[PDB]
């Protein structure tokens, strides 16, 4: 709860904003509106695009690529809001930018933002 | 033991005695100096290969044998997607069931039957020794056991270190031994965040231990017919390649037009591209994906021809959900993907990149 | 004592370590059961709103449903679907109005119907459960219209079509009792029974008058469609009970939720859904607190529990929060649900002992309406 | 601040929920979103319908009839929310009921709730 | 001492006592002037949103405008009109997407134009003022498209119709310099100048690369169309200045908003609208605080003020609140506007001394963007 | 002056000598026993009045003089709303300007001119004494002076408490001397929350000192022609009553069809209703307003004829913003409003209320 202090990751609770995989999340944790860490809630639509970040995992000391994907087609969840920005770059480097609504590829052309999932898609580097 | 089995398969692999007129071995089409693909120039360029008879051409591009050992045995998964197997249509379950079929294919090596193979095996004293040492005395006198044993040896050979060394630049960067260049890291970032990774990565999520840049699935990406290859194959221009639907026992019409996702390892040196070798250049292969995403005029045009791609050979079961990403790759991103894919070249073929 | 967020961290970490794959995808919510509870958030009159689908037993959000301006939610008692009547505009809160009913699948939450209501016929009011209601067979949705005059709209959910408006007398609320019948509460202090068809002036019959012009019957009565029991508190905690199980109204003896001494010391009901009824127990639950007489929409901190037959008080629970609405699950060992508009939190209590068991926070901007299915 | 306390009217600040004319208001005070005590904010539409209340004016000891009228066609203002219910009766006595959106007769068929105004229409009887 | 609500009660009591009649009516906002300030609430990505129009002198809301999902507000420097590009859906957050431009009268707040944008072309992103942009003559509105590729839409406000999209290269933001010309910022480090006649490809010309790969330019620079000063801070607090007043780009001396020591001890810009530029005074204003390098979007409690010609610091203010965005009035003795997303409150400061004069609270759910008109 | 001028006007008010054939006084048409309205049946019932010649009918219903002295003189307010004046079309500025006009109007009292009126006044010695005592000697010898003084006396007389006693049940209840029945109270609640109050209350807000239940504005509510009255008047089947636009000096086409909002005081005893006397029953006047708000078939039907209300005489400038309230009056609310409007009856006419 010091906002300007270096972000301290934890691996014990996925609903809180300091969970290690949320290091560059912008919005809401889908685990808090009926999805899960890596799945969308019912009635929403899973985008295919993603911004990515290398998030340090305090547990095994390894860095993993989290490819954030949005669940779209609902109004914002309003539960478990978080904005982190580890390694986050301005819009002109979109692959690393998180103000952008990554709902591209979602079924039914869904582009409204409900929440975001935090899957590992790789090792850093 | 397994050493000897594969050592036997290493002999068979380069032996033209397994072709009717003895003009070709597995290595003739799967040239080790070319990442186990065919260097030769036929009627349709390098799009399709020429059999033992000097004239017959196939209808499909010869694929690399690198990393083919990592592919699981053909099966249907719990989500009802077919996965794994061998050949572009998965018609062979695994490497063992695949190995016999070039020997007997008349448009390829063109042996008349298992007996003619056994007969040719039995003419070599080294095979009599090597085979009887692993499978028992007389095994070459039974055509069925002999053919099966040769298929085993070849499958064992294809599963050695040599075909799957994991010594690409990509592998060295994942072990922390070097770093991507800026362009290469941009391409890798783009590869895992664009739609590529929905098909060309082993797992949906997590990290794979031995990544081969394919999820082993079957997809119709809407490719046109390759006109000169189809003509050289002589299968008739009324012919339709139905892909996985051609595997005996697959019946579900939703599988027509779908092919196995190729591993992208060595892709930079195994041109031309796709199941029918339609695109000579890697960058053209990348650009084909823009036809589903980009507004621009030039996205309809195959840069190799200066003409529209062509209608899909099979205009249904297109993987639209994956392909209609809503985002077009600009030149800088196509550039960067080319660089990243170049880093999947095994060490020993780095000299081929030019 | 291990929270759901912690349990999920522990399981993702095991998966990552075991190298376990899994495909990112759209979840289905769990099968509807007795301990599913819906919380609607009218968001203090905002143009768009949300409903949270919550598993009461786990205290976990299992889904959401978006809506428009002051929608009316309904839930089929049998659990086969949910629906709402809702209202949008072409430019947020301005321009062309479209009123419509959606029916949804209770596990995918996908709309299985979207039925336009002609001529913007919905009653726009802070949300009262019994201004939109399902017939017991689940085939028909009935919605109140106020303007230009009291009427009731008939929507055929099976054929997915608006049928007709019914003219009614000067009455309010809609308590269905049969596939073609419902009751309303009238200005004149009667109930009206309304028996309708596809056409024709409906058969409208009034009961006897059952209360004086100066006892005020609250906007949020409890009604158990399955029991045919209509539980209607007044501003003083006096409770009217009407038995409609026979298809005609029968008036039961009135009970007092508060004692004479409580009432002399300023105890009164107050909140939004200030009453709940548990059908299998035949129990009534009333939100009460010490308050001035004209503070009847303020939160309360106490629930009294009384036997519906005798009016005997069974418990008085100190809720320990500012509670605006209550309801109960309809299973044995029911939960008592206590929703705070101010805290935007559903507090879930053991209804026998009153003890707070768990809670679900972050439920929108001004959540007010708790709905459960009576699946028994 | 005791919410259950008998409400106590003042005549010194119209933006506060205890201002005497707001004795049966439900919503938001129009003065706080560019209206005034008795006028709607620009771009909204003034209803002709109302609900009424008798509100005691402590400046002069008289009770006045306040005919609340809504300003409609905009999303709820979100400023100066208030809910009072002096004399407020249930829905079946709609002239005294304040959960109802009193937007009838607004220009352009505007029925969304934005805020409420508090004009006097009479002395109490 | 006397608040607006109190003064309001005194006036209304005098009218009552004096028997003064007056007709309930729709108010007009006052004439746009230099102290008028607009605050946009993107509402943490809610499907509907609000703009508050504020008299900064009195610290009084004088109007509001509703928008849809992540609208882009613009304000005509001359005060003649305001506009936004906005996005709605047929069923709150789902169904058919309509992107449209509305123009409003700046005293009635009535829409004077509603121009539909074909094929849902808007870039949906947390709100950046220079992703949508008026030409200096106010006849043309230009909006950024990211999908399927960077492009720029041209909307004719005079004719009230969409015209066409322009193909651009891999560039971002839109800074209009004339009726037919705008600059963007490109991935490769250059600026791109885009000149478009009515037809064909636009003529596109790059500057040199003016910053490196490792140097990160914020999403919210400040651009004064009337001075043609583009003011672009980086993550460290270094500030790029590009003059566009000649119609071509000319790069002014780079400058540093923080001292080498202050960087060393943790001082960095951070927030949303981290930078303001006052044209008359030629003076830059920069939200900064002590923070880790990847906490660039968090609130900052300090502002520094420095001369744009020289680089010299003129003041450092402790704002006394968590501030996400800043801007200034463009008149003499400007106000410094300090917007807190977390407090939902616009703190209004004397820009000369940094003292807080007054404030405006309850500005929605997550207010982030301040716009002012430059009218002198 | 005060008492004496009113008392002179009391004598004139009742004096038939101001009509050509001397059959007719103010009081003939403005009968003090019927709230200063005309009880006489003519060729169109009580809708329009019969003049001195025994034959001619007017085209407009004779209004009450009760409370008329509360109306301001004619003017345009800053909103651009015309306000006040006398006659249904406001063509007289005030009571004094109005008073001489039924004396010279051939369809009413029919005196040929001012000198003829002066001649009648000169013949009564009580007028010679009363007129000269107030306006000086020889006043009755100058026709313009005599006529103007007579108008003045008459205006004065209508300004007395006799005309505006404020002793209705509503007045008693507002002073705390009695209380409304629940029905009347509901009627008042309805009147002040529904659209009635938009036109039938003095003020837009605040409290009026002497409420007369009109804002004195001009509105076209879209009434049809009363065919029997229009036939009796003889003005022609092609004739259009333009309301306010008929005031000389008003040229604005938007004022066509607008009429002065009447005071609802004594409304229960001054039937029939509207400027052309078109509706017989108070209830019907109330139900008229449902044509703009109710979706029911019956709301299109004048319950007195069984037929549609009828096409407006003037189908433009209707007050639609006020009239299209979006809420219909049910029968309980109409009853309540009837109850309430009955409390606006002055004490002396309470006995008239049974019938
Ligand atoms: C005349 C050229 C030719 C010769 C000789 C030939 N192949 Fe092939 N090979 C191909 C073609 C063409 C395909 C793809 C055919 C298809 O998909 O139906 C292929 C496919 C394969 C595959 C499956 C690879 C994949 O990714 O699906 C394996 C394994 C293989 N060959 C091994 C061999 C072995 C072992 C031999 C020696 C017995 C051999 N090949 C001889 C042309 C040849
Ligand atoms: C729907 C899943 C899918 C997606 C997404 C996809 N591919 Fe492919 N890719 C395939 C399939 C299947 C083939 C073989 C198609 C055929 O030959 O019929 C293929 C073939 C290729 C080849 C030629 C390989 C060879 O050996 O002939 C390259 C290069 C390639 N893809 C690159 C990409 C890139 C880069 C992306 C991201 C832009 C991409 N692909 C996206 C499924 C996919
Ligand atoms: C033949 C019947 C008749 C007689 C006699 C008559 N009036 Fe009238 N009075 C009417 C009619 C009819 C109207 C409405 C006329 C119109 O609006 O054009 C009217 C209107 C008025 C009005 C306007 C009131 C209002 O609310 O608009 C006043 C004042 C008035 N009369 C006073 C008098 C006086 C004074 C006398 C005697 C000098 C008089 N009347 C004689 C029939 C009569
Ligand atoms: C648009 C303003 C307006 C509104 C709103 C309105 N009235 Fe009227 N009312 C009038 C006008 C004007 C007349 C005169 C019409 C005419 O004769 O042309 C009138 C006439 C009447 C009369 C007949 C009076 C007489 O002496 O002939 C009654 C009764 C009446 N109104 C009652 C009501 C009631 C009750 C309501 C609420 C339902 C109401 N009005 C709403 C303007 C209004
Ligand atoms: Ca190839
Ligand atoms: Ca009359
Ligand atoms: Na070819
Ligand atoms: Na098959
Ligand atoms: Na008639
Ligand atoms: Na005229």
Which of A76, A85, A92 lies at the smallest CB-CB distance from E187?
A92
CA-angle at F189, arms to F184 and F193, nearest 5°: 145
Torsions phi, psi of B143, nearest 5? -55, -40
DSSP at C325: E
Residue E184 and residue E168 in contact, taking contact as beta carbons nearer than 8 Å: yes
A52-56 β-sheet, strand order: A52-56, A63-67, A120-123
| Chain E neighbours, 3+ Cβ pairs < 8 A | A, B, C, D, F
- Does the domain at F166-355 match CATH 1.10.760.10? Answer given as yes
Among C43, B55, C54, F266, residue whose Cα is nearest residue E46: C43
Resolution (in Å) of the shown entry? 2.0
The CA distance from B281 to C313, in Å, is 85
Residue E238 and residue E304 in contact, taking contact as beta carbons nearer than 8 Å: no
- Name the closest-CA residue to atom 29, ligand 2: B285
B196 is in an annotated binding site: yes
Residue D29 and residue D89 in contact, taking contact as beta carbons nearer than 8 Å: no
CATH code, domain with D117: 2.60.30.10
Q: Per DSSP, what are the bridge partners of residue C142? A: C133, C154
- The CATH architecture to which B1-165 belongs is Orthogonal Bundle (1.10)
Distances in Å between the Cα of C216 and the Cα atoms of C171, C178, D8, D86 are: 14, 28, 23, 14
- Name the closest-CA residue to atom 13, ligand 3: F62
Q: Per DSSP, what are the bridge partners of residue E183? A: E175, E193
Contacts of B244 (CB under 8 A, 6+ apart): B82, B89, B90, B218, B250, B255, B256, B258, B259, B260
Q: Per DSSP, what are the bridge partners of residue F308? A: F301
The CA distance from B44 to B116, in Å, is 31
Question: How close is the Cα of F186 to the center of ligand 6, in Å?
Answer: 25
DSSP at E4: H
Is C298 buried (19+), middle (13-18) or exposed (0-12) by CB count in 10 A?
Answer: buried
Across E223-245, b (16+ Cβ under 10 Å) vs e yields bbbebbbbbbbbbbbbbbbbebe
* C-contacting residues in A 75-94 (Cβ below 8 Å): 75, 77-80
The CA distance from E281 to E271, in Å, is 24
Distances in Å between the Cα of E91 and the Cα atoms of C92, E95, E331, F126 are: 11, 6, 44, 85
Question: How close is the Cα of F247 to the center of ligand 10, in Å?
Answer: 5
Distances in Å between the Cα of F184 and the Cα atoms of C218, C337, D50, E289, F339 are: 25, 44, 19, 69, 5
The CA distance from C303 to C315, in Å, is 8
Name the domain count of chain D.
Answer: 1
H or E segment to which residue E147 belongs: none
List chain E domain ranges.
1-376
- What the block records as the tokens of A35 is 């999805």
The CA distance from C167 to A7, in Å, is 63
Partners of residue A93 in chain E, C-beta under 8 Å: 187
3-state secondary structure chain F: CHHHHHHHHHHHHCCHHHCCCCCCCHHHHCEHHHCCECCCCEEEEECCCECCCCCCECCCCCCCCCCHHHCCCCEECCCCCEECCECCCCCECCHHHHHCHHHHCCCCCCCCCHHHHHHHHHCCHHHHHHHHHHHCCCHHHCHHHHHHHHHHHHHHHHCCCCCCCCCCHHHHHHCCCCCCCHHHHHHHHHHHHCHHHHCCCCCCCCCCCCCCCCCCEEEECCCCCCHHHHHHHCCCCCCCCCEHHHCCCCCCHHHCCEEECCCCCCHHHCCCECCCCCECCHHHHHHHHHHHCCCCHHHHEECCCCEECCCCCCCCCECHHHHCCCCCCCHHHHHHHHHHHHCCCCHHHHHHHCC
Strands C171-178, C181-186: pairing is antiparallel
Q: Which ligand is nearest to the CA of B320?
A: 2
CATH number of C1-376: 2.130.10.10
The CA distance from C245 to E67, in Å, is 49
DSSP at B115: H
Residue B232 and residue B57 in contact, taking contact as beta carbons nearer than 8 Å: yes
Residue B11 and residue B242 in contact, taking contact as beta carbons nearer than 8 Å: no
C91–E88: do the CB atoms touch at under 8 Å?
A: yes
Question: How close is the Cα of B157 to the center of ligand 1, in Å?
Answer: 14
DSSP at B304: T
Question: What chain C residue is nearest to E96 in terms of C-alpha separation?
Answer: C90
Residue C30 and residue C55 in contact, taking contact as beta carbons nearer than 8 Å: yes
Question: Helix (H, G, I), strand (E, B), or coil: what is residue C170?
Answer: coil
Which of B79, B205, B207 lies at the smallest CB-CB distance from C24?
B205
H helical segments located in chain C: 4-18, 260-264
Question: Helix (H, G, I), strand (E, B), or coil: what is residue E163?
Answer: strand
| Chain C neighbours, 3+ Cβ pairs < 8 A | A, B, D, E, F
Partners of residue C110 in chain A, C-beta under 8 Å: 42-43
- What the block records as the tokens of C133 is 């209601």
Helices B125-135 and B2-13: crossing angle in degrees, nearest 10, is 150
Among C364, C259, C376, residue whose Cα is nearest residue C38: C364
Residue E115 and residue E162 in contact, taking contact as beta carbons nearer than 8 Å: yes
The CA distance from B30 to B25, in Å, is 9
Q: How many CB atoms sit inside 10 A of residue F26's CB?
A: 26
Question: What chain B residue is nearest to C20 in terms of C-alpha separation?
Answer: B206
Q: Which ligand is nearest to the CA of B264?
A: 2
Question: Helix (H, G, I), strand (E, B), or coil: what is residue B297?
Answer: helix
Q: Is the peptide bond before C308 cis (omega within 30 degrees of 0)?
A: no
Distance from CA of F328 to the nearest CA of C (A): 5
CA F337 to chain CA centroid, nearest Å: 20
What's the CA dihedral at D34, D38, D43, D46 to 10 degrees? 160
The CA distance from B141 to B134, in Å, is 15
What's the CA dihedral at C357, C360, C365, C367 to 10 degrees? -60
Positive or negative: CA dihedral F26, F27, F28, F30: positive
What is the CATH class of B166-354?
Answer: mainly alpha
Rg of chain B, C-alpha, whole Å: 21
The CA distance from C50 to F236, in Å, is 65
Question: Helix (H, G, I), strand (E, B), or coil: what is residue D65?
Answer: strand
Interface mutation target, options E148, E166, E186, E192, chain B, most CBs of B under 10 Å:
E148
Q: How many CB atoms sit inside 10 A of residue D5's CB?
A: 12
Residue position matching structure tokens 């009147």? F191
List chain B domain ranges.
1-165, 166-354
3-state secondary structure C76-143: CCCCCCEEEEEEEEEECCEEEEEEEEEEECCCCCCEEEEEEECCCCCCCECCCHHHEEECCCCCEEEE
The CA distance from D46 to E355, in Å, is 39
Partners of residue F209 in chain E, C-beta under 8 Å: 19
Strands C132-134, F43-46: pairing is unpaired
Among B254, B257, B291, residue whose Cα is nearest residue B80: B254
Q: How many CB atoms sit inside 10 A of residue C251's CB?
A: 14
Just list the catalytic residues of D: 51, 70
Residue B98 and residue B104 in contact, taking contact as beta carbons nearer than 8 Å: no
The CA distance from F129 to C203, in Å, is 77
Residue B186 and residue B343 in contact, taking contact as beta carbons nearer than 8 Å: no
Question: Helix (H, G, I), strand (E, B), or coil: what is residue B69?
Answer: helix
The CA distance from A20 to C16, in Å, is 13
Contacts of C214 (CB under 8 A, 6+ apart): none
CA A32 to chain CA centroid, nearest Å: 13
Question: Helix (H, G, I), strand (E, B), or coil: what is residue D56?
Answer: strand
Q: Is the peptide bond before F272 cis (omega within 30 degrees of 0)?
A: yes
Residue position matching structure tokens 């914020």? E218
Positive or negative: CA dihedral B137, B141, B142, B147: positive
- What the block records as the tokens of F126 is 């009580």
Among C87, C91, C82, residue whose Cα is nearest residue C54: C82
């Amino acid at each position: 709860t010091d906002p300007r202090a270096k972000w301290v990751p934890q691996d014990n609770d996925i609903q809180a904003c300091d969970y290690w995989r949320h290091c560059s999340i912008d919005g809401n944790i889908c685990d808090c509106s009926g999805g899960s860490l890596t799945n969308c809630p019912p009635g929403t639509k899973l985008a295919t695009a993603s911004w990515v970040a290398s998030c340090y995992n305090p547990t095994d000391g390894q860095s993993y690529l989290i490819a954030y994907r949005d669940c779209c087609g609902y109004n914002v969840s309003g539960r478990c809001p978080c904005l982190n920005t580890e390694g986050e770059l301005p819009v002109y480097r979109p692959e690393f930018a998180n103000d952008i609504i990554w709902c591209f590829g979602a079924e039914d052309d869904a582009m409204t933002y409900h929440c975001t999932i935090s899957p590992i898609v790789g090792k850093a580097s | 033991a397994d050493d000897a089995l594969a050592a036997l398969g290493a002999q068979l692999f380069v032996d033209p005695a397994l072709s009717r007129n003895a003009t070709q071995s597995c290595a003739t089409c799967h040239d080790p100096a070319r990442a186990f693909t065919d260097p030769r120039e036929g009627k349709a360029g390098l799009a399709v290969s020429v059999g033992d008879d000097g004239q017959s051409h196939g209808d499909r591009n010869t694929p690399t044998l690198g990393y083919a050992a990592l592919v699981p045995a053909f099966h249907r998964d719990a989500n009802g997607k077919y996965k794994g197997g061998q050949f572009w249509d998965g018609r062979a379950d695994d490497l063992k069931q695949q190995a016999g079929q070039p020997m007997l294919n008349p448009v390829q090596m063109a042996m008349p039957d298992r007996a003619a193979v056994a007969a040719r095996l039995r003419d070599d004293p080294a095979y009599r020794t090597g085979f009887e040492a692993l499978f028992g005395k007389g095994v070459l006198d039974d055509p069925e056991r002999a053919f099966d044993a040769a298929a085993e040896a070849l499958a064992a050979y294809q599963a050695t270190g040599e075909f799957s060394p994991f010594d690409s630049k990509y592998d060295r960067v994942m072990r922390g031994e070097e770093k991507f260049t800026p362009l290469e890291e941009f391409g890798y970032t783009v590869f895992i965040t664009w739609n590529c990774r929905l098909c060309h990565m082993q797992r949906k999520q997590g990290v794979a231990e031995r990544e081969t840049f394919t999820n082993f699935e079957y997809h119709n990406i809407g490719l046109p017919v390759n006109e000169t290859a189809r003509e050289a194959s002589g299968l008739g221009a009324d012919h339709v390649d139905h892909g996985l639907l051609a595997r005996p026992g697959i019946e579900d019409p939703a599988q027509s037009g779908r092919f196995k996702v190729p591993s992208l390892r060595n892709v930079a040196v195994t041109g031309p591209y796709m199941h029918n070798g339609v695109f000579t250049d890697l960058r053209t292969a990348i650009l084909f994906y823009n036809k589903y995403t980009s507004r621009r005029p030039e996205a309809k045009i195959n840069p190799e021809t200066g003409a529209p791609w062509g209608e899909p050979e099979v205009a249904r079961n297109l993987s639209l959900a994956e392909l209609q990403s809503g985002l077009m790759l600009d030149d800088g991103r196509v550039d960067a993907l080319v660089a990243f894919l170049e880093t999947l070249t095994d060490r020993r073929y780095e000299p081929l990149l030019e | 004592q291990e929270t759901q967020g912690q349990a999920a961290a522990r399981a993702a970490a095991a998966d990552l370590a075991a190298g376990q794959d899994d495909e990112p995808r759209i979840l289905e919510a769990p099968a509807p059961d007795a301990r599913r509870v819906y919380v609607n958030d009218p968001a203090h009159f905002a143009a768009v709103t949300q409903q949270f689908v919550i598993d009461g037993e786990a205290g976990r959000v299992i889904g959401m449903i978006d809506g428009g301006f002051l929608p009316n939610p309904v839930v089929a008692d049998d659990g086969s679907f949910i629906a709402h009547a809702s209202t949008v505009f072409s430019r947020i809160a301005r321009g062309e109005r479209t009123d419509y009913v959606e029916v949804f699948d209770p596990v995918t939450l996908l709309p299985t119907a979207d039925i336009e209501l002609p001529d913007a016929p919905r009653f726009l009011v802070g949300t009262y459960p019994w201004m939109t209601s399902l017939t017991p067979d689940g085939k028909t949705l009935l919605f109140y219209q106020f303007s230009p005059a009291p009427a009731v709209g008939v929507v055929d959910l099976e054929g997915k079509a608006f049928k007709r408006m019914l003219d009614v007398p000067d009455c309010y609320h809609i308590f269905p009792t049969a596939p073609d019948t419902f009751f309303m509460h009238c200005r004149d202090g009667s109930l009206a029974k309304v028996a309708f068809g596809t056409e024709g002036t409906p058969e409208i019959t009034h009961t006897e008058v059952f209360h004086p012009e100066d006892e005020f019957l609250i906007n949020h009565p409890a009604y158990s469609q399955k029991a045919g029991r209509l539980v209607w508190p007044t501003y003083t905690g006096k409770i009217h009970q009407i038995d409609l199980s026979s298809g005609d109204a029968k008036f039961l003896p009135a009970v007092e939720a508060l004692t004479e001494a409580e009432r002399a010391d300023g105890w009164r009901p107050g909140g939004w859904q200030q009453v709940a009824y548990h059908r299998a127990l035949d129990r009534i639950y009333l939100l009460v607190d010490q308050r001035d007489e004209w503070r009847h929409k303020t939160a309360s901190r106490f629930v009294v529990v009384l036997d519906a037959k005798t009016g005997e008080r069974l418990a008085k629970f100190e809720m320990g929060h500012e509670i605006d609405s209550i309801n109960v699950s309809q299973d044995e060992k029911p939960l008592l649900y206590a929703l705070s508009t101010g805290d935007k939190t559903l507090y879930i209590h053991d209804a026998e002992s009153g003890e707070e068991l768990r809670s679900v926070n972050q439920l929108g901007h001004g959540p007010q309406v708790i709905t459960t299915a009576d699946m028994g």
